[PDB]
Amino acid sequence: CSNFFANHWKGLVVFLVPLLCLPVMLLNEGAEFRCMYLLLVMAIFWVTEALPLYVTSMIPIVAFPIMGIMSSDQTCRLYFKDTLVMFMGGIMVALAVEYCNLHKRLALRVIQIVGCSPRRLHFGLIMVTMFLSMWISNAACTAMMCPIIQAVLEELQAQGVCKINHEPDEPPYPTKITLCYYLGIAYASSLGGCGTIIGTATNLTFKGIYEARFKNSTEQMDFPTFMFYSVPSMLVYTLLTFVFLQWHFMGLWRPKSKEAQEVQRGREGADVAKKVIDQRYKDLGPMSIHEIQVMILFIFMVVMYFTRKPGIFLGWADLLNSKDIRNSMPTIFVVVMCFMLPANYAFLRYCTRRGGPVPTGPTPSLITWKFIQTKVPWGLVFLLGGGFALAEGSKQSGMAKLIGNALIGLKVLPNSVLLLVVILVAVFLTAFSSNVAIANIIIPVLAEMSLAIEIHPLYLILPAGLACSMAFHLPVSTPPNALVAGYANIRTKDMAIAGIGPTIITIITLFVFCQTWGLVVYPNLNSFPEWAQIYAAAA
Amino acid sequence: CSNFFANHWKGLVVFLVPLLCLPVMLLNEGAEFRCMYLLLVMAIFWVTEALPLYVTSMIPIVAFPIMGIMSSDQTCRLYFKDTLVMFMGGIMVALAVEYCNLHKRLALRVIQIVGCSPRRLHFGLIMVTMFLSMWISNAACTAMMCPIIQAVLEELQAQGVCKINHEPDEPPYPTKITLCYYLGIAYASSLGGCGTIIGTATNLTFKGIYEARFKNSTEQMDFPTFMFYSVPSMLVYTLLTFVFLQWHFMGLWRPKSKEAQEVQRGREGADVAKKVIDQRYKDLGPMSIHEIQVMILFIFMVVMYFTRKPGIFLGWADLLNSKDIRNSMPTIFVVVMCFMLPANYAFLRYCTRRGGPVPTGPTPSLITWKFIQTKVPWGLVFLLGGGFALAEGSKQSGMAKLIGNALIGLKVLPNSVLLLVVILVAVFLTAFSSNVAIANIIIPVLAEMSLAIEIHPLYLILPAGLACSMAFHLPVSTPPNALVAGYANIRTKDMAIAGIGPTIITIITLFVFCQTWGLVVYPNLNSFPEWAQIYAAAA
Ligand SMILES: CCCCCCCCCCCCCCCCCCCC(=O)O[C@H](COC(=O)CCCCCCCCCCCCCC)COP(=O)(O)OCCN
């Protein structure tokens, strides 16, 4: 009976896939193919959610020492790197913000400014998120923006506009509005990261690779030039992504279905919403010292993030250069300071003697550990560590060299087809792995290939370098996806279906604006310059 | 203003202590003094519990990179080492045991065997824990035995004998009987570790140091001789520790409230308790496939623990020698296998068609991630990683060499006084640091100093090597204490007060049995052998 398959397919996958993928290991002798087998099995498990994602991420610890790739002590330390500490600290600080009810104040202020229309609110949030992510790391922006979205959704539910969760082990399912807002936040962060060389680590990585490999080159990837080259495309496909998201979930062009909610909100928003929102804001009262301290700490953390080695002026990392200090220091500093500081300052009435009442007990701090344990999604440690460890193991085993030597066979294709195929390959590879690792794998091969067939290296390097960052399908592809999926339970199926669109939008936009607008910034992109001839003759 | 001190002393300590400890860095020059300042501040925070322990353990991440001792990336990677993964996996497997109600079955079986008297049950549990900890790592035994103690306490409460917790945001306070049981488990593991070379890593460490430093030695610390030397003392002070614990938490020799509570137990539970217990056991059905599978996995895990490179026979770690498997493999393997396997095995009715309704749904696994997230104390990650990070920082900064040089000046004292002072110093230094670390910092100095004066090296090395493992005062001293404090909410003051007994008992017992019984096992211990003279002359 097919009912058997309908009920117990997950166990069938778990039991059958390794045996079916065994020939990959058995037919080939090198150590590379064992790592390839492991990667294939994990990918198949990730796509179908046969096992919980966190459990699947634990496999490398068992697998690598047996395969002979890395020692057990070396594997376990690849998890819990510096960047992972930064992510977890960001989550903790966001929880601290949520604890003092600051997010409700910000959400009410925003709704009061914009006008209480779900469409306009969505547009404003997307634009603000993109602009912020243009300057800071993506995960920080996503973790910052999650509670604000939560508060806005709660307000809309309170007005009776929409329901956050589907009506009834398994956590509650999210409604289409929730998916729209959260996926919008994540995609906006990922898209806005590409605007500036400070936006994400991938830009710095491939810029450094290009500068090191090619010197004595006329073209420069200077800070203003890169922004001049990248911003217009960013704007165009950000707007197109917003429109697609509105069409998919809110029925923008179709008044047959789902239009009822937005029109119903629009009709009553003119008077009732305006009369109610301001009163609710008044009911909060003046901002208290608790929130002032939390806000000051958050602003300090962001400023410290921005001013560490910005590249356009001296940074505080240049001072204190005895040992390499990275971004985890300010975050943990803030987390500790949250516990150290008090929340009232009402006890000074003893020394001042001006005040009558006394606390009659210890003054609570800014946050409590019981709150942090209950809310933090501790499973993310294994997922992100699995990504890092898998990348490092792929480096050491020798599979990255295998892929690089595999790609060299694309010299036959004409130029435009070659560019399109390169973009597609970059997207497909980055779907399953860290962006930085994919860039390291791909760029040098492209440089050598370009020198082989007499093409200006930038013409191929820049589109691929940008394309490495376009990942929208799976929670493992990029940290913002994982954070959003953890915060509000989002299943993989819905997110892949939703992401099927921005992939096409970004590919087409990147192709067209490259081939057309890149000439304006770099006039000699089509021609093959002299210094390239010198390098080719040398090689 | 006395009430002000009574209420707000914690924050007063937090504010004042760093300023008062600043002269340590200010007056002295080297980096080791900065490391010493950090260690002193963290110790004072640990003792008074001004901050949560988990928060205090985070300070090294901020402190070390600023002081220039270590880079930021290395410090974070020192956390979450291999051994920490082993501990966390052990906790997860214990939770898996708790999920399927196996612990109740084991507890009822034990109560049937022993006889349902709190005193006799406590004695039996202590002896069993000691015997197991002879052969396995201590943390494994503690994580093994926590749920069993929980189940036994629940049964006794259901009989109306005692109450686990005091009558009510903070977690509940445990009563005296709970403290007695849990502290007994932890102390029993620590004490029983010293019996055998395999028992703990400290024994292996100092045995290896002695063998490497002094070849050509007549006396041998092989497997049987060490056991012959160590077992009798271990039995004596285990028994004395049990007697002290009974005296302190129950009225063993005092007419008190606790004395009445225990003494009344025998009257009502002469035979009614036996009848009720047998009825309750018969109420439970026969073992299901769930419990059988969990038990098989647990036994497999323990066997893999034992058979990895023992001295007496060949181990599986010697095979697969390409990389160090290093014992994390079995634990994570078991954890993953728990999620992979099913629970009912009733779906085979499709193929066999023997009879019975089809499940009409997915079959649940052995455990669920929601259960794991709720129960595991996740702060233990930071609390245990702090020890490794702090130890490595101490090695690199240069503190350890400073302490070793400071220890030389003791050579002026006579022999027995020297032995006593050595034992005291070893205990004091192991209460704020990892046991293995203190051994590496103290043993070579003792070897050289014993060569300098005319003393047999074993006479000093062996008692100190045993003494390094006696830590009973703080949750940070040794992993069993941390696990017990996490599982049942135990404040530091109670543990610190209770730890006075075992410290004195062990110190006196080692002193006396060394000086008396050691000569029987190793004759000519007092005299200076020939090879010692050769080694001393060649210096
Ligand atoms: C020494 C190493 C190997 C140890 C192996 C131990 C286990 C041995 C076999 C135990 C019995 C398995 C019986 C399988 C019968 C065929 C499949 C029947 C249908 C089926 O898959 O039903 C699911 C059970 O599957 C399952 O139970 C699938 C998992 C089976 C065990 C895991 C095997 C992994 C092998 C990995 C290594 C391969 C070789 C590498 C060199 C329940 O389906 P459901 O949807 O109702 O429930 C999903 C879970 N909740």
Ligand SMILES: CCCCCCCCCCCCCCCCCCCC(=O)O[C@H](COC(=O)CCCCCCCCCCCCCC)COP(=O)(O)OCCN
């Ligand atoms: C960050 C944004 C700040 C914005 C401005 C906010 C206002 C000023 C904030 C700083 C104020 C510092 C001085 C506060 C008054 C201290 C009065 C005596 C101590 C006292 O009241 O003790 C507790 C408060 O402690 C405390 O309040 C001490 C908290 C820790 C202070 C810093 C400690 C480290 C200083 C040295 C660092 C560098 C060392 C050298 C490298 C009482 O409260 P409680 O004990 O009942 O409850 C504590 C929570 N549970």
Ligand SMILES: O=S(=O)(O)c1cc(N=C=S)ccc1/C=C/c1ccc(N=C=S)cc1S(=O)(=O)O
């Ligand atoms: O990829 S590596 O772990 O080798 C790495 C080496 C670096 N060497 C230097 S300097 C600097 C960064 C770095 C990794 C960073 C990321 C790796 C994967 C990410 N997403 C996924 S999956 C996101 C980041 S991010 O924090 O940079 O955005």
Ligand SMILES: O=S(=O)(O)c1cc(N=C=S)ccc1/C=C/c1ccc(N=C=S)cc1S(=O)(=O)O
């Ligand atoms: O302490 S060290 O990080 O130097 C260390 C070096 C090793 N080099 C090698 S091979 C092997 C193990 C090892 C650490 C072991 C422990 C360190 C601290 C502990 N408690 C505290 S605080 C308990 C243990 S345990 O593993 O004995 O349980």
